[PDB]
Design a protein around this ligand. Structure first.
Ligand SMILES: Nc1nc2c(c(=O)[nH]1)N[C@H]1C(S)=C(S)[C@@H](COP(=O)(O)OP(=O)(O)OC[C@H]3O[C@@H](n4cnc5c(=O)[nH]c(N)nc54)[C@H](O)[C@@H]3O)O[C@H]1N2
Ligand SMILES: Nc1nc2c(c(=O)[nH]1)N[C@H]1C(S)=C(S)[C@@H](COP(=O)(O)OP(=O)(O)OC[C@H]3O[C@@H](n4cnc5c(=O)[nH]c(N)nc54)[C@H](O)[C@@H]3O)O[C@H]1N2
Ligand code: SF4
Ligand SMILES: [Mo+6]
Lengths: 982, 113
């Protein structure tokens, strides 16, 4: 008979995939029953059938986890690379901690800035910066936030900077919050699934099962719009091509089509958006430029981008929508230039295909039909990234799809925990809970609070950010405890104050000028992931010291080592001291991570880490306690802010995940009473809602949107009830979502002004005569139907913005601008303004930009389903599935260059080159754009110089060092290259 | 002598364990007039035992072992939050789940460890 079942007596542990943001459940199997004498070893991993999103399924990345956990390239011991050396030397943990602390202290004491030139206390340290791990837990993230900020760091970013920064920059201004609005299983309710700006069948495969459920079992139409015919196109009902960098034209064309045919949800638009508000008379737009442009600073004065004010100080309105200055009529005028011929001329999308998409989208303007948009980097990674997103969001507000089951904006996050690190604020000027560090002009608490607490711009609105001071003071009580009191303004002056944002491109520009001494890379591989790799390696080489913390060997850790054409450097010329510290991976600790749907999910430890690897919090605590002890005995600069940060863990060298998770939830520091004199919480108890946070020092929380995650009822992130009573796929008992377990944001819009569902088969919330109740937790207060209170409760006007007032850097309405490296060399809509007029482009990077005479083809970079960044090439299973680097090109271009399928080619740009196998296919086809034939060369990003797959070249050797005008997110998706036979 | 078991020829372990823990024989109130236990309920601490005939316990140091919260001797939480190997959630120790006797001496006269 068959071999026996190999897991019958193994230890079974629950955990969550460590790669993308779907958050699939895992069941991991270890050799050993947990007895103290058996050292557990994970030997198989499969899916958890009870998880509501994955239901047992795992894509090739999650299914291959065993080979990542047990990779031959797992890091085992602390290693050190001496200046000008060509080899690693093994050191002890205590030597690593003491050498790093000494280097840090010397640099901090030399360059710490206590006061700025205007006399304000700013306590900031700029010569050492940090990259944080979006693949590590939320408890690691909060420890990293405390470590960084208590030292005064401002150059602190996580992957959000090169990823979904633009989403937050456009979705927050439009709807009030920057996160994905619905959740994976909810996509099954859609009537139309649009995959544009994303490739969900390859980038989020197990979450995409729900789009296949809507197509196959809800009769939905799946549409893919992309320069390439991808694996998501394989299963699509409609495929339409589009030139990289032209989404705003296509989407603005869709707005013009909807308005012109009156394919809108008119009552939704009239009440839930700002359509009826009146805009200042001085607002204008002409020939590519909005009013207020200052051509020398390349920035706009946004004074005119605002509403007209009434007598009470509120925005003026015209409910009939006939006034020439209402948002609705200015929107109509703005998009009138984007006709179907203009879309075809700029995007290259055939009019017949563009028409099919417009007609299907238009069918969801009915109240009981919805479109859901699934997108990610195809829209964010541009110099107009944020504006791409604004256009789509506007479409969803015209169709009335926000707040509906099967509707919304599913901005699919990337890393497993990029949503938690964004929530915890590991971004230059951020604090946890979407709070902001003080700017250096805000000289006291009162100024700071006033700048961050918005006044309502229409009467009768929830305007929930009016509670900013309760969140802020609670954060300060979490950080400083008894040291933060009313008398010292809750420790206000201990936080670093910023003079500007220290985004990654800027900070590498400072590193190139010799202003950066040290850098930490915690679970981030910038040699692979940052634009213009040859410049990145040059900038890192000027560092005096680098600390890498990771479970695997990365290209970044070996940037000083010669790897031939892949990394042609001279070790003897690089003086950086490099510390490589071996950390745990997802399977070797307990903790939480937040998926794309905002679900905070707990996971448990299945084995110890290999060798002398330690957990991320233990590595930060080693360095931190050595450093703070040096300050205790030698003194130095910025002593107080550093020494006042709390580190209240039972074992200070080993902070536990539950202690940190509980601090994020928050506690009552005194007994708390409601207005009726009823006890709401006792001193010492975990809080059950952010509604109980106060601004008087009686409450603490290091992450206000996380209040409710771990209460007196227990760890809600460990809840495993997959019940779905409505049949809509909403499982309120599985894990815990922020905010307050609301799974579908903006769900008051799922009903009309009288409280009646737009679609009676999809009721989310309903009015019972005194409260809202239903199949989801209401994202709303208790305003009764018929009152003026808008459903977007974080917006000061309570509405979805069609016109984004003064929030966007380049305009309150989106406008087409070409990529910095464009194949046309001009912009057919307005040749006087080719590219975004507010883009920041450093002079050194401007010299490294190419033109179409030398680099005639559009270059774009993207992912393949089988690999995750340059991480899974260290896993044998994934290396077998896609072993060797390739690039994709059309049959037409291959014939022109005499390239046969499978031949080697050389792909180059103004910054460098890569060599690879050529995949020649009809899936890529030239498009007719502005009288030219434009070809695209496709460059997957998974290969490099470390790993078990065949050695290749970093794709970022080709990409430009320029980014979105709002978040500085690099333009990785549209640039210019040349190709030659090799 | 009492032999108050549901089957007198086969006294059950839980009946005897509950007698060792002890019971409130009348409703019991603290000095502030707050109910501490109802008549018939298992006591939660020997602090609630009285000398007036309103409480019973056949083993006062065992009060807390099996309360209204259940059999504490069956608790199986091996958590050790301090790292010192103290597992207050595994089984139940006398007296009142104190695992290290004389632990006020683990600090000096001012309370410092
Ligand atoms: N398989 C796999 N999964 C991933 C990842 C991975 O490494 N491997 N990474 C995770 C991360 S961190 C992220 S943020 C996500 C992103 O996930 P996605 O953004 O979906 O994935 P990409 O492949 O980067 O890009 C999507 C598509 O953009 C198309 N495209 C190129 N330029 C343009 C253009 O300007 N407009 C339009 N409309 N489309 C364009 C590309 O051809 C590609 O099909 O993936 C996550 N999931
Ligand atoms: N050309 C081009 N460039 C891109 C993009 C693109 O489409 N085009 N996409 C961009 C985006 S959206 C992103 S997110 C990036 C990502 O690029 P990166 O995030 O730098 O790349 P990864 O290879 O995903 O690196 C993650 C590291 O985390 C380590 N990690 C795993 N778990 C832990 C842990 O528990 N703790 C620690 N300390 N380490 C851990 C892994 O070993 C791995 O080394 O690439 C970006 N760059
Ligand atoms: S990579 Fe994403 S889709 Fe694949 S198993 Fe992991 S979490 Fe699921
Ligand atoms: Mo990403």
């Amino acid at each position: 008979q068959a071999r026996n079942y190999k897991l019958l007596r193994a230890k079974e542990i629950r955990n969550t995939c460590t790669y993308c943001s779907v958050g699939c459940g895992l069941l991991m199997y270890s050799l050993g029953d947990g007895a103290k004498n058996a050292r557990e070893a994970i030997y198989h991993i499969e899916g958890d059938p009870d998880h509501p999103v994955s239901r047992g399924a795992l894509c090739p990345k999650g299914a291959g986890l065993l080979d990542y956990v047990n990779s031959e390239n797992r890091l085992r011991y602390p290693e050190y690379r001496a200046p000008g050396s060509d080899k690693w030397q093994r050191i002890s943990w205590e030597e690593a901690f003491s050498r790093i602390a000494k280097l840090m202290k010397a640099d901090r004491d030399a360059n710490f800035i206590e006061k700025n030139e205007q006399g304000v206390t700013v306590n900031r340290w700029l010569s050492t910066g940090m990259l944080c791990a979006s693949g590590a837990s939320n408890e690691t993230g909060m420890l990293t936030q405390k470590f960084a900020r208590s030292l005064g760091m401002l150059a602190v970013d996580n992957q959000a900077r090169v990823x979904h920064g633009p989403t937050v920059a456009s979705l927050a201004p439009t709807f009030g919050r920057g996160a994905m609005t619905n959740h994976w299983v909810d996509i099954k309710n859609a009537n139309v699934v649009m995959v544009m700006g994303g490739n969900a069948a390859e980038a989020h495969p197990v979450g995409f099962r729900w789009a296949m459920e809507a197509k196959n079992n809800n009769d939905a139409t799946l549409i893919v719009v992309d320069p390439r015919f991808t694996r998501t196109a394989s299963v699509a009902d409609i495929y339409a091509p589009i030139r990289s960098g032209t989404d705003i034209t296509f989407l603005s064309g869709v707005l013009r089509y909807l308005i012109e045919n009156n394919k809108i949800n008119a009552e939704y638009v009239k009440h839930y958006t700002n359509a009826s508000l009146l805009v200042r008379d001085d607002f204008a737009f002409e020939d590519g430029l909005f009013s207020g442009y200052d051509a020398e600073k390349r920035q706009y004065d946004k004074s005119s981008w605002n509403y007209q004010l009434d007598e009470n100080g509120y925005a003026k309105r015209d409910e009939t929508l006939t006034h020439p200055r209402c948002v609705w009529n200015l929107l109509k005028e703005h998009v009138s230039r984007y006709t179907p011929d203009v879309v075809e001329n700029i995007c290259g999308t055939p009019k017949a295909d563009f028409l099919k998409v417009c007609e299907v989208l238009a069918s969801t303007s009915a109240p009981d039909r919805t479109t859901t948009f699934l997108y990610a980097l195809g829209w964010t990674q541009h110099t107009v990234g944020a504006q791409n997103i604004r256009t789509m969001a506007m479409i969803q507000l015209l169709l009335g799809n926000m707040g509906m089951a099967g509707g919304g904006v599913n901005a699919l996050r990337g890393h497993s925990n990029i949503q938690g690190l964004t929530d915890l604020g590991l971004l230059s000027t951020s604090l946890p809970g979407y709070l902001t560090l003080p700017s250096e002009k805000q000289v006291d608490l009162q100024s700071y609070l006033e700048a961050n607490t918005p006044k309502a711009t229409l009467a009768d609105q929830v305007n929930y950010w009016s509670n900013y001071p309760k969140f802020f003071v609670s954060l300060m009580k979490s950080f400083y405890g008894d040291a933060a009191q009313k008398e010292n303004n809750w420790g206000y002056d201990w936080l670093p104050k910023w003079d500007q944002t220290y985004d990654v491109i800027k900070y590498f520009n400072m590193m190139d000028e010799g202003k950066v001494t040290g850098y930490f890379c915690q679970g981030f591989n910038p040699v692979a992931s940052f634009p213009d790799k040859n410049k990145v390696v040059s900038c890192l080489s000027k560092l005096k010291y680098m600390v890498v913390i990771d479970p695997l060997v990365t290209e970044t850790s070996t940037f000083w080592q010669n790897h031939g054409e892949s990394n042609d450097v001279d070790p003897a010329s690089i003086q950086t001291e490099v510390f490589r510290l071996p950390s745990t991976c997802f399977a070797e600790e307990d903790g939480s991570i937040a998926n794309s749907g905002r679900w905070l999910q707990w996971h448990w430890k299945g084995q110890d880490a290999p060798g002398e690897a330690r957990n991320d919090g233990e590595i930060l605590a080693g360095i931190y306690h050595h450093l703070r002890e040096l300050y205790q005995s030698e003194g130095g600069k910025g002593v107080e802010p550093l020494m006042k940060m709390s580190w209240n863990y039972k074992q200070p060298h080993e902070p536990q995940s539950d202690e940190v998770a509980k601090e994020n939830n928050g506690y009552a520091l005194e007994d708390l009473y409601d207005a009726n004199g009823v006890l709401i919480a006792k001193k010492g108890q975990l809080l059950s809602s952010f509604a109980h946070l106060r601004d008087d020092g009686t409450t603490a929380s290091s992450c206000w949107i996380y209040t409710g995650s771990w209460t007196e009822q227990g760890n809600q992130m460990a809840n495993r009830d997959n019940s779905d009573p409505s049949g809509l796929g909403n499982t309120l008992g599985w894990a815990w979502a922020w905010p307050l377990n609301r799974r579908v944001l903006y769900n008051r819009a799922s009903a009309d002004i009288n409280g009646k569902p737009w679609d009676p088969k999809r009721m989310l919330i309903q009015w019972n005569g005194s409260k809202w109740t239903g199949n989801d937790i209401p994202d709303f207060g208790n305003a009764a139907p018929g009152t003026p209170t808008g459903p977007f409760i974080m917006q000061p006007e309570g509405m979805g913005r069609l016109f984004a007032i003064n929030k966007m850097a380049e305009g309150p309405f989106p406008e087409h601008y070409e990529p910095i490296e464009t194949p046309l060399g001009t912009n057919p809509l307005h040749p006087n303004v080719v590219s975004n007029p507010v883009v920041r482009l450093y002079e050194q990077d401007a010299l490294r930009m190419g033109k179409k005479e030398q680099f005639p083809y559009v270059g774009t970079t993207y992912r393949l389903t089988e690999h995750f960044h340059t991480w899974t090439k260290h896993a044998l299973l994934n290396a077998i599935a896609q072993p060797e680097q390739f690039v994709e090109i059309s049959e037409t271009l291959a014939a022109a260059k005499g390239i046969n399928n499978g031949d080697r080619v050389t792909v180059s740009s103004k910054r460098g080159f890569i060599r690879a196998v050529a995949v020649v296919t009809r899936r890529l086809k030239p498009l007719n754009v502005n009288g030219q034939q434009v070809e695209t060369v496709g460059i997957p990003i998974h290969w490099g110089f470390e790993g078990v797959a065949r050695k290749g070249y970093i794709a970022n050797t080709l990409t430009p060092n320029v980014g979105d005008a709002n978040s500085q997110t690099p333009e990785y998706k549209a640039f210019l290259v040349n190709i030659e036979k090799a």
